[PDB]
Design a protein around this nucleic acid. Structure first.
Length: 150
RNA sequence: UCCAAGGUGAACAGCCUCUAGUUGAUAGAAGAUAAGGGAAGUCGGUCCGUAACUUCGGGAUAAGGAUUGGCUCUAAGGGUCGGGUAG
């Protein structure tokens, strides 16, 4: 609802805060003091990519943008951005804290309420449909998608 | 000069019939084929076996035997009601 969106945006704009948002906030709106931008997946269209990581860097401020790749066709996204005059420097991040039970923890938390199971399966299917409507078909292939991994 | 059924034909045609008309016309009796030769003649010789397809609407939303749940932003998505502890 519009009122809830306005209230959430004005609470976030007003102390260290993390925002889980779709492409609604990607373009146009300016939240000051935003340091880090993470794109858990590359966008459906690449034109919006520059907007999603564009919320930072105002007045050459020290801000970082990070993106995540699926290891299968990751060799095509970087040159695609390079042709569009965008250079993505590879970053190596250690997967800390995953010694044991992360997927087990997720699974046993899903088993508590069937609503959680429904929301998870619905989100997975929605992501599959979202990946189906992807530009640059060669880069993002449905066949090469890691269905079990997702 | 007017009216004008049906079925086969599956090529106008021809053939057969329904409704409706005829039995009229002196009566009785008693073209085809061919063995061998081949112009020697005369002026002149549609139906059985395959495969892909293939008609109308209504549906919108990735499918339509399966465990259906299916993208981002963007008008509306039936009405109403309901929030704590203390003085």
């Amino acid at each position: 609802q519009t009122s809830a969106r306005t209230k959430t945006l004005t609470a976030f704009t007003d102390s260290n805060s993390v925002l889980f948002t779709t492409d609604v906030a990607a373009r146009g709106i300016d939240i000051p003091d935003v340091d880090l931008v993470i794109q858990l997946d590359p966008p459906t269209n690449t034109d919006m990519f520059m907007h999603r990581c564009g919320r930072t860097g105002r007045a050459n401020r020290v801000g970082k943008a990070i993106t995540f790749l699926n290891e299968g066709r990751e060799e095509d996204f970087i040159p695609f951005m390079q042709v569009k005059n965008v250079e993505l420097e590879e970053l190596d991040l250690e997967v800390k804290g995953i010694t044991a039970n992360f997927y087990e923890d997720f699974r046993n938390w899903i088993l508590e309420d069937r609503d959680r199971f429904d929301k998870g399966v619905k989100a997975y299917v929605a992501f599959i449909k979202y990946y189906s409507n992807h530009s640059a078909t060669s880069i993002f292939r449905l066949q090469s998608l890691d269905y079990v991994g997702i």
